[PDB]
Amino acid sequence: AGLTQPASVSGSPGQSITISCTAANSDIGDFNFVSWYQQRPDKAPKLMVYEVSSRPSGVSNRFSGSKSGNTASLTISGLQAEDEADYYCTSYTSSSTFVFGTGTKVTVL
Amino acid sequence: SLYKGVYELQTLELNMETLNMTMPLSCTKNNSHHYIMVGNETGLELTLTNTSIINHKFCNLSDAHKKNLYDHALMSIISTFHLSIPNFNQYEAMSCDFNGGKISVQYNLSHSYHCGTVANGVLQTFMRMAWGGSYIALDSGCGNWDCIMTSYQYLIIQNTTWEDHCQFSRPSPIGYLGLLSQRTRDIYISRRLL
Amino acid sequence: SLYKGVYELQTLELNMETLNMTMPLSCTKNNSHHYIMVGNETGLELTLTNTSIINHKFCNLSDAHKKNLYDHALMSIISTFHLSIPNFNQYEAMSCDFNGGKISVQYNLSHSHCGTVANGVLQTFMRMAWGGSYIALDSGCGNWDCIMTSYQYLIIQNTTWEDHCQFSRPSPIGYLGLLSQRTRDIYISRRLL
Amino acid sequence: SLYKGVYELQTLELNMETLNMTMPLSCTKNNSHHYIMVGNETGLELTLTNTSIINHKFCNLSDAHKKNLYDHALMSIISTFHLSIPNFNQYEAMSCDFNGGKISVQYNLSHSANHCGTVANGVLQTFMRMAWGGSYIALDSGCGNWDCIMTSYQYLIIQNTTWEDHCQFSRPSPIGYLGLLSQRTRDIYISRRLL
Amino acid sequence: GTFTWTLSDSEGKDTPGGYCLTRWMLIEAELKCFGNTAVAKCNEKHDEEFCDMLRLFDFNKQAIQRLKAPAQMSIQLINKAVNALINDQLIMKNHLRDIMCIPYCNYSKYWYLNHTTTGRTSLPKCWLVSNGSYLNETHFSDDIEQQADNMITEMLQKEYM
Amino acid sequence: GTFTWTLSDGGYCLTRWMLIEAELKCFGNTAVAKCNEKHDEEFCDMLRLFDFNKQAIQRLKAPAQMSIQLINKAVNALINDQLIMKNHLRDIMCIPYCNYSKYWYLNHTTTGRTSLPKCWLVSNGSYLNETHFSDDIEQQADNMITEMLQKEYM
Amino acid sequence: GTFTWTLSDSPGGYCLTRWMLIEAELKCFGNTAVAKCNEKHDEEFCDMLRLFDFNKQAIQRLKAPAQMSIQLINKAVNALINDQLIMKNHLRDIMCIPYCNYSKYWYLNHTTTGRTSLPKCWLVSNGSYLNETHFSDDIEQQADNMITEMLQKEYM
Amino acid sequence: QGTLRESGPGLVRPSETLSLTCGVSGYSISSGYYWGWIRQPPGKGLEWIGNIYRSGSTYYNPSLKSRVTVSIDTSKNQFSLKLNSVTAADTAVYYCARSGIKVADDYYYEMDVWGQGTDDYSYAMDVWGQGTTVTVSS
Ligand SMILES: *[C@@H]1O[C@H](CO)[C@@H](O[C@@H]2O[C@H](CO)[C@@H](O[C@@H]3O[C@H](CO[C@H]4O[C@H](CO)[C@@H](O)[C@H](O)[C@@H]4O)[C@@H](O)[C@H](O[C@H]4O[C@H](CO)[C@@H](O)[C@H](O)[C@@H]4O[C@H]4O[C@H](CO)[C@@H](O)[C@H](O)[C@@H]4O)[C@@H]3O)[C@H](O)[C@H]2NC(C)=O)[C@H](O)[C@H]1NC(C)=O
Ligand SMILES: *[C@@H]1O[C@H](CO)[C@@H](O[C@@H]2O[C@H](CO)[C@@H](O[C@@H]3O[C@H](CO[C@H]4O[C@H](CO)[C@@H](O)[C@H](O)[C@@H]4O)[C@@H](O)[C@H](O[C@H]4O[C@H](CO)[C@@H](O)[C@H](O)[C@@H]4O[C@H]4O[C@H](CO)[C@@H](O)[C@H](O)[C@@H]4O)[C@@H]3O)[C@H](O)[C@H]2NC(C)=O)[C@H](O)[C@H]1NC(C)=O
Ligand SMILES: *[C@@H]1O[C@H](CO)[C@@H](O[C@@H]2O[C@H](CO)[C@@H](O[C@@H]3O[C@H](CO[C@H]4O[C@H](CO)[C@@H](O)[C@H](O)[C@@H]4O)[C@@H](O)[C@H](O[C@H]4O[C@H](CO)[C@@H](O)[C@H](O)[C@@H]4O[C@H]4O[C@H](CO)[C@@H](O)[C@H](O)[C@@H]4O)[C@@H]3O)[C@H](O)[C@H]2NC(C)=O)[C@H](O)[C@H]1NC(C)=O
Ligand SMILES: *[C@@H]1O[C@H](CO[C@@H]2O[C@@H](C)[C@@H](O)[C@@H](O)[C@@H]2O)[C@@H](O[C@@H]2O[C@H](CO)[C@@H](O[C@@H]3O[C@H](CO[C@H]4O[C@H](CO)[C@@H](O)[C@H](O)[C@@H]4O)[C@@H](O)[C@H](O[C@H]4O[C@H](CO)[C@@H](O)[C@H](O)[C@@H]4O)[C@@H]3O)[C@H](O)[C@H]2NC(C)=O)[C@H](O)[C@H]1NC(C)=O
Ligand SMILES: *[C@@H]1O[C@H](CO[C@@H]2O[C@@H](C)[C@@H](O)[C@@H](O)[C@@H]2O)[C@@H](O[C@@H]2O[C@H](CO)[C@@H](O[C@@H]3O[C@H](CO[C@H]4O[C@H](CO)[C@@H](O)[C@H](O)[C@@H]4O)[C@@H](O)[C@H](O[C@H]4O[C@H](CO)[C@@H](O)[C@H](O)[C@@H]4O)[C@@H]3O)[C@H](O)[C@H]2NC(C)=O)[C@H](O)[C@H]1NC(C)=O
Ligand SMILES: *[C@@H]1O[C@H](CO[C@@H]2O[C@@H](C)[C@@H](O)[C@@H](O)[C@@H]2O)[C@@H](O[C@@H]2O[C@H](CO)[C@@H](O[C@@H]3O[C@H](CO)[C@@H](O)[C@H](O)[C@@H]3O)[C@H](O)[C@H]2NC(C)=O)[C@H](O)[C@H]1NC(C)=O
Ligand SMILES: *[C@@H]1O[C@H](CO)[C@@H](O[C@@H]2O[C@H](CO)[C@@H](O[C@@H]3O[C@H](CO)[C@@H](O)[C@H](O)[C@@H]3O)[C@H](O)[C@H]2NC(C)=O)[C@H](O)[C@H]1NC(C)=O
Ligand SMILES: *[C@@H]1O[C@H](CO)[C@@H](O[C@@H]2O[C@H](CO)[C@@H](O[C@@H]3O[C@H](CO)[C@@H](O)[C@H](O)[C@@H]3O)[C@H](O)[C@H]2NC(C)=O)[C@H](O)[C@H]1NC(C)=O
Ligand SMILES: *[C@@H]1O[C@H](CO)[C@@H](O[C@@H]2O[C@H](CO)[C@@H](O)[C@H](O)[C@H]2NC(C)=O)[C@H](O)[C@H]1NC(C)=O
Ligand SMILES: *[C@@H]1O[C@H](CO)[C@@H](O[C@@H]2O[C@H](CO)[C@@H](O)[C@H](O)[C@H]2NC(C)=O)[C@H](O)[C@H]1NC(C)=O
Ligand SMILES: *[C@@H]1O[C@H](CO)[C@@H](O[C@@H]2O[C@H](CO)[C@@H](O)[C@H](O)[C@H]2NC(C)=O)[C@H](O)[C@H]1NC(C)=O
Ligand SMILES: *[C@@H]1O[C@H](CO)[C@@H](O[C@@H]2O[C@H](CO)[C@@H](O)[C@H](O)[C@H]2NC(C)=O)[C@H](O)[C@H]1NC(C)=O
Ligand SMILES: *[C@@H]1O[C@H](CO)[C@@H](O[C@@H]2O[C@H](CO)[C@@H](O)[C@H](O)[C@H]2NC(C)=O)[C@H](O)[C@H]1NC(C)=O
Ligand SMILES: *[C@@H]1O[C@H](CO)[C@@H](O)[C@H](O)[C@H]1NC(C)=O
């Protein structure tokens, strides 16, 4: 069906922002290993977070994930202007199927 | 009564709780909840229920083994339980969750649904692990080995704190000690080279 | 034959076929074919032969477990037979096929002569079909570590019940004996088993 | 020494080396080196030491099994030793090497405040039972301690060697190995649902 | 293979060859001592539930008294020692009797014949259960009678010695 | 552990269906009770297996498809597997061994008293001649006579 | 389960040759003592007689491989010895109790008749053999058993 | 390290079959990683098409299960997508991906041949291709 995700999140430079990613209570088994990707304009998605707060090498510590119950979230601490991009959450469904979110448009003010 | 004019009949009842520091002790609380206790501290609660707690089909034992964080006696009990399940072939039936060092194992008895199925093997091992009064939970109660079945949908094994739950039957190591011998007797091969 | 002038020697031969509904019963038909009957319905045929049937290096046990189209008793017999092998360390030596609930296992004995995989397979074959496996072996006795046959393939196939037993009577002794030795000779293939 | 007037006490000691052609025989040279001999040609050296010989986390059992360049008796002894370890869960603590048919296994006993739940105690219990004739001197305390066995040494090294009469401190015996045979896979953990 | 653990000289009130169950090992009961003639059978018979329990209790006592206790209670020792203390196939026999709807011993309650004047006691036999309750002393009456005869038989060899 | 199953039923009787070309054969309590203690009696292990088969078919519900789960758990309580294993060891070492097929017992001609059946050994693909273990048979005869004398001693 | 290996003849009994004993000529034990091994479940010396006899028969009757297999023993051990007796001695060792290490055995020898007892194991506590003063009670008990069986033998 | 590169028709007509080939350079497809296709229609969120493994096993989206095939060719070190019965909704940018998942089915199968694997399963599309645009039009 697809994971619910906010359409837009916003904040000013330096503050923390949080992008949530919520699954339905009828699909808790489909909500596992929630990993988060950044897609800049006209670029391929890049993995920022996998598992919970584990990140690839070269990704700063500003990006950090959390997971609880039917929800997960990505926290961008110390927001900067270069963080503007489309952030997508995806879960690994137990039938071996990636299920993406709807995508969040982060805006820096 | 009195036999042969000189012999009075007398009885004992062993205080089996005193075996707590050396070995596990298993008992039955009521129809749905059964327990095994480890020390005067911890143990596992075996609940037959219609309500699942793990909605996913993952059980990564190796990651739990890497991190430790779990009571080794409890995980030994879990391993003794799982290894003795006869003819276990549907791996998706079992799920578990060891996050933060806890123990939670869920067998989906409704996955395999009359006789000679995975749910019957799980219930056979359950009846031996909780032999002190777990016959009430099973439907027939007797006269059935390969056709053992219960109305409940899931068997849930969760780590708990010690508490005098032994209402229906007295604590006993007998089920666990019996399962130790018959450990790897009925495991199927899944590999040419184990 | 009267012993002590008092006691007459009398013989007693047990009909083991009445144990058909509780346990497997193994027997020998001739040099090449041996059988293990389960129920009055099914069983496995253990054939020593010079001709292969599998002709590939796959044995998808894990897929057969999920499909669950097989006889559980027969697969338990196969599991006991395999896990009773002394020193099985050549995964390419064994192949099988479980298409559609079938059971068809093949052991390649060409990998050879003492202390090899073929000898272990022939030892477990000897114990499983103990009622007349000695005729197939090159030496009936006096040999454990260097048991060898002229046949290159041991082939285990699910079959139907029929009066196969000609050379030896049905007997559960091989299977029941192998149940105790079922896992006591295994090599570690991984640090955390 | 006559008991009840007419019964002399007499002693009997079994020469156990004559069992060399049928079964392994284990002994102790000193507290650091112990041996398990398989016949009159080969065996395994069990050395407790602070010096590591394997400095990698690979062990590669499957490649060794496929190549099949090792002695089968020695690998059977290694498998019995490992499968007798109770509650083995830290696989990084163990490493090994089998290049060219060699056998060289290293258990890192320094992988471990109470020091009672560690994998090192499983390794040391199985080591104590494998070399039961004279392993007790290598431990901190000879007796009165099972769950919390320790030794000052940091590594246990099981490596193939040639036969030689090393049995200085204790006489050779099969009893440790034969006892460990019945305990294989008795107290190991599941690692995967289907096994 | 076969049990080998031998009971310690737990209590000198009786003969040292006997064995006594303290109040801690018994439910709602005082000290109970069984003579050497009863517990001697535990070194030969492979079908006595009570002897297996005696060995378990004695092993527990010795283990908690002699060995250093770890911080968390470890079941490693019993997992190694279980087959030296008890006959696991006796537990299997009781399981088989349970599933087949035969009376069986659950390893809780036992009965023995106590001689009124001498205090001699037989080895306790297990009080069997069936259909969720005890057998009410009548359905296995033939057992007690024969056991009584055994004690009678047992004194006769003591007379003839 | 060791075998624990108790034969249900004095003595014990092998019905016609349990035997190859034979009628009902009953052995008294003196011979059958030997099975309770001895760990090296092939016939006793077979007798326990047949009794277990009878009880299992009578008392437990049968699954529609056959299952060998019950025997896989119950075997060690019925038989001394190391007796089978001794027989296999004597087989490979070219020693006479028991395949558990044929048994012999000494029957008293006038009283009908019978010994516990001892297995008829095989070697080199055929049954041993009687002569080759006549020395064994004589010993069994002596034992029976001794037991008779013991019954007179009481 | 239970051991089943029946030993072999040298009037029955069993004889250990100089290659089986450490600095000793050939020693024989009569059938009256060796026959106890058929039923006794907790005798170390009986397990050792069965191991030695099995070795003697195995190296004679079976075709030897080029290199050792240790496959015959790994399968046959449960029919030769009581492994739980080894576990008993392990338990006695760890608990600071005297235990058998399967090295030295003691038996009483009747001076005029030469009759002997199924040897009992000599125990070790702190890496050294116990003095006979610390288990003289068992020696007296074995002597009493010899007097008892001799009385029953004369009673024949 | 290495790169993934799409290549194929940038234009298909309705009801014909799209065929895209992803070439992998610097990584070995025979390594234990799952090679997959993801889709981004022009302005909408990401949609996972499927993936294939070195064992030949394939996994697909339930919606895109009847129309799609994903194939693997280890000899040339490439994989590929084949989407038949294309329609207007299939106009999108198609991305390669290297994914570090563990499916139990492929785990249990390769145990004897490929032995014990790693445990560093990210369960994420570790590497991505540049992405190729495809328009379904006449
Ligand atoms: C072998 O086979 C036998 C026969 O089947 C089996 O016996 C049964 O064992 C169980 C477990 O001990 C017995 O259950 C106990 O029964 C007593 C008495 O029940 C009567 O009295 C109570 C009074 O409240 C009534 O409610 C009840 O309806 C009966 O009339 C109960 O008192 C026990 O419950 C208490 O003790 C339990 C712990 O032992 C507690 O868990 C429970 O919460 C209760 O607490 C009591 O004690 C507390 C002490 O702190 C106190 O604070 C509480 O207020 C309360 O007083 C328990 O139900 C059952 O009666 C036995 N039945 C028979 C036929 O004998 C063996 O168990 C079995 N053994 C094995 C090893 O399998
Ligand atoms: C323990 O060790 C002993 C000794 O080694 C071993 O004994 C041997 O057992 C086998 C199996 O029973 C015996 O084989 C049987 O022998 C009879 C007689 O064979 C002779 O006569 C025939 C006549 O045609 C000759 O051809 C043959 O060469 C011999 O001279 C056979 O008649 C048996 O075969 C028939 O019955 C079988 C029953 O299973 C059928 O399967 C088979 O197809 C045959 O059927 C025919 O007869 C049936 C009625 O009997 C009838 O119903 C069918 O329709 C058909 O007409 C079989 O070959 C062998 O003789 C024994 N040898 C000795 C020394 O006694 C034990 O078996 C062994 N036990 C274990 C557990 O290992
Ligand atoms: C059960 O438990 C008992 C008691 O704990 C245990 O007994 C001990 O067994 C060991 C092993 O046999 C004994 O160790 C032997 O001791 C003798 C005597 O040692 C003293 O005298 C020598 C004299 O040179 C001193 O060097 C030494 O420091 C002591 O003062 C030694 O002579 C033995 O060494 C020789 O034999 C060994 C075994 O063959 C060889 O490996 C060693 O190299 C020596 O032989 C070589 O050199 C000799 C030099 O003379 C030469 O003669 C030989 O031909 C050869 O070239 C060995 O150290 C220990 O003393 C026993 N302790 C007691 C209390 O009896 C059992 O072993 C144990 N059993 C089991 C199975 O666990
Ligand atoms: C097996 O399942 C394990 C449990 O996973 C749960 O169940 C499954 C079915 C899914 O539902 C999943 O969503 C559930 O969480 C799973 O455990 C996970 O393992 C990973 C990898 O070890 C852990 O990542 C680590 O995270 C910590 C920080 O996270 C903190 O919070 C989480 C909970 O939110 C805690 O669990 C953690 O312990 C932490 O407290 C990182 O610190 C750590 O390493 C970081 O630092 C090192 C320094 O060298 C860096 O190298 C790393 O890159 C990191 O920066 C890991 O990143 C994850 O937290 C953990 N979750 C839980 C709940 O345990 C396991 O991964 C699965 N394994 C397999 C093989 O599938
Ligand atoms: C046992 O299991 C083996 C593994 O099976 C896979 O994993 C398991 C867990 C399941 O998920 C299962 O569904 C998976 O398939 C299995 O081996 C595999 O078998 C399949 C066929 O069943 C093979 O697929 C075929 O591939 C060839 C192309 O591959 C060739 O080249 C490669 C090298 O690049 C070689 O390694 C191959 O051997 C081949 O030479 C396809 O041509 C073929 O048909 C496809 O193409 C035609 C074109 O007309 C289409 O019509 C078909 O629909 C297909 O699209 C298959 O796709 C797979 O390669 C093979 N993998 C391995 C690792 O061997 C084995 O067959 C099973 N054996 C038994 C007896 O059960
Ligand atoms: C093998 O190594 C052990 C342990 O050694 C110590 O731990 C290792 C992991 C390494 O980090 C080593 O560098 C480190 O020394 C040795 O046992 C140890 O022996 C030393 C003395 O040689 C002990 O040092 C004492 O420490 C106390 C601390 O309060 C001081 O008061 C003493 O004055 C003294 O310095 C050390 O405690 C002890 N540790 C253990 C675990 O027993 C062992 O001797 C060594 N063996 C050999 C021969 O290599
Ligand atoms: C679990 O098992 C242990 C060991 O059997 C039990 O401990 C024992 O508890 C009894 C009753 O409290 C103690 O009896 C008394 O102990 C005190 C303190 O030592 C003593 O002063 C009295 O004279 C009397 O002996 C017994 O000593 C004690 N033993 C040990 C070693 O702790 C415990 O009670 C059991 N707990 C459960 C869950 O039943
Ligand atoms: C435990 O196992 C049972 C049986 O496998 C699981 O129940 C099954 O759940 C799945 C997913 O919901 C069902 O699939 C769908 O079910 C609906 C029911 O109307 C059907 O319309 C769909 O076509 C599809 O089949 C499946 O039918 C259902 N089976 C049964 C017998 O209930 C259950 O979800 C498992 N629970 C856990 C926690 O794993
Ligand atoms: C099951 O075990 C877990 C893990 O030990 C218990 O949760 C821990 O409880 C301790 C108590 O001291 C805390 O310090 C830990 O932080 C807890 N861990 C986590 C991850 O929450 C849990 O309480 C046990 N279950 C029950 C019912 O007692
Ligand atoms: C059974 O094993 C034998 C021995 O490995 C196989 O025969 C060999 O196969 C290889 C590889 O094709 C050839 O190079 C050899 O020349 C063959 N040797 C002989 C003596 O024929 C045989 O193919 C295997 N059988 C099966 C069915 O896999
Ligand atoms: C199966 O084939 C093998 C050869 O691959 C046959 O055995 C060999 O036959 C040759 C030629 O006759 C002899 O020189 C060898 O001595 C034989 N080897 C052995 C080990 O016996 C074998 O006979 C064939 N099997 C059958 C049943 O015909
Ligand atoms: C071996 O087993 C297979 C699989 O069970 C048997 O073939 C099946 O036979 C049944 C008979 O009712 C059919 O319903 C199935 O459709 C068959 N399955 C397949 C895949 O063909 C086969 O007959 C057995 N072998 C023998 C020799 O009887
Ligand atoms: C451990 O075993 C290895 C392998 O057998 C031994 O090294 C071999 O020694 C023989 C001696 O004839 C050489 O022919 C081989 O080439 C050696 N193999 C390799 C790979 O070098 C080694 O000596 C043994 N270890 C000890 C200490 O003796
Ligand atoms: C006892 O038997 C009666 C019938 O006589 C039955 O109603 C009852 O449920 C049985 N109890 C148990 C615990 O099985």
Residue numbers in the entry:
A (entry chain L): 2 to 9, 11 to 30, 30A, 30B, 30C, 31 to 95, 95A, 96 to 107
B (entry chain C): 60 to 172, 179 to 259
C (entry chain A): 60 to 171, 179 to 259
D (entry chain B): 60 to 171, 177 to 259
E (entry chain c): 260 to 420
F (entry chain a): 260 to 268, 276 to 420
G (entry chain b): 260 to 269, 275 to 420
H (entry chain H): 1 to 35, 35A, 36 to 82, 82A, 82B, 82C, 83 to 100, 100A, ...
How did the manuscript describe this experimental structure?
Therefore, to generate a trimeric GPC immunogen that presents all currently known bNAb epitopes, we reverted the RRRR site of GPCysR4 to the native RRLL sequence. Next, to characterize GPCysRRLL-I53-50A in molecular detail, we used single-particle cryoelectron microscopy (cryo-EM) to solve a 3.0 Å structure of GPCysRRLL-I53-50A in complex with the 8.9F Fab. Our GPC model shows a near-identical structural homology to that of a previously described detergent-solubilized full-length native GPC complexed with 37.2D and 8.9F Fab, as measured by the root-mean-square deviation (RMSD; 0.53 Å among the full 8.9F sequence and 190 pruned atom pairs per GP1; 1.0 Å overall fit across all sequence-aligned pairs with PDB: 7UOT29). Consistent with earlier observations, 8.9F targets the trimer apex, making contact with all three protomers while using its 31 aa CDRH3 to penetrate the 3-fold axis in between the α1 helix and the complex-type glycans at position N119. Meanwhile, the light chain (LC) interacts with the neighboring protomer, principally making contacts with the N119 glycan. The presence of sulfated tyrosines at these positions was corroborated by running the 8.9F heavy-chain (HC) sequence through Sulfinator, a bioinformatics tool that predicts tyrosine sulfation in protein sequences. Thus, in contrast to the previously described structure, these post-translational modifications are present in our 8.9F model. An additional difference between the models was at residues 204–214 in GP1, where the presence of the introduced prefusion-stabilizing disulfide bond in GPCysRRLL-I53-50A leads to an alternative conformation of this flexible loop. Considering the way 8.9F engages with the RRLL sequence on all three protomers of GPC, we hypothesized that 8.9F may have a stabilizing effect on recombinant GPC trimers.
